[PDB]
């Protein structure tokens, strides 16, 4: 029972690690879109800081 | 420090210049309420008087 629970929590943590990596990718795409929209002056230095956080 | 965008600074500057044009409209209209003589010379007599 213990080795079954350990293998299943290993698979679950690898799956949600992959999902967290995909959310990091989408957040990085949001950040460099906001950085592109910050240099020319559409977005101020508040939405850029929110995307950075 | 860019705590406000350049877009909503150019919008506010455009609103300021447009309102300054709309108030100098009323300033030259007050300049038209009083009657300024356009050229210099011998003025004749008044065709309409005070109160007409």
Question: Would you write up a description of this structure?
Answer:
Chain B: It comes from Pseudomonas aeruginosa (strain ATCC 15692 / DSM 22644 / CIP 104116 / JCM 14847 / LMG 12228 / 1C / PRS 101 / PAO1). Chain B: This is Multidrug resistance protein MexA. Chain B: It is found in: Cell inner membrane. The structure is cut from a larger assembly and holds chains A (53 residues) and B (52 residues). Chain A is an all-alpha fold and 53 residues long. Chain A has helices spanning 2-39, 47-52. Chain A contains 2 helices and no strands. With 52 residues, chain B is an all-alpha fold. The interface between A and B is small, with 7 and 8 residues.
Largest sheet of chain B: none
Helix/sheet category of chain B: mainly alpha
Radius of gyration of chain A: 18 Å
Order of helices and strands of chain B: H
Radius of gyration of chain B: 21 Å
Helix content of chain A: over 70%
Helix/strand/pairing category of chain A: mainly alpha
Quaternary class: part of a larger assembly
Number of helices of chain A: 2
The sequence of SSEs of chain A as H and E is: HH
Strand content of chain B: under 5%
Count of beta strands of chain A: 0
The helix count of chain B comes to 1
Number of strands of chain B: 0
User: What separation lies between the terminal Cα atoms of chain B?
Assistant: 60 Å
**What percentage of the residues of chain A does DSSP assign to strands (E)?**
under 5%
Distance between the termini of chain A: 41 Å
Subcellular location (chain B): Cell inner membrane
Family (chain B): Belongs to the membrane fusion protein (MFP) (TC 8.A.1) family.
Organism (chain B): Pseudomonas aeruginosa (strain ATCC 15692 / DSM 22644 / CIP 104116 / JCM 14847 / LMG 12228 / 1C / PRS 101 / PAO1)
Protein name (chain B): Multidrug resistance protein MexA
């Amino acid at each position: 029972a213990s080795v079954a629970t350990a293998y299943l929590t290993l698979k679950a943590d690898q799956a949600q690690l992959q999902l967290t990596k995909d959310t990091l990718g989408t957040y990085q795409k949001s950040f460099d879109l906001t950085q592109r929209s910050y240099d020319v002056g559409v977005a101020s230095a508040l939405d850029l800081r929110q995307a950075q956080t | 420090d860019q705590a406000v965008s350049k877009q909503q600074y150019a919008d506010a500057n455009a609103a300021y210049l447009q309102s300054k044009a709309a108030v100098e409209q009323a300033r030259i209209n007050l300049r038209y309420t009083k009657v300024l003589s356009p050229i210099s010379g011998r003025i004749g007599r008044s065709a309409v008087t005070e109160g007409a």
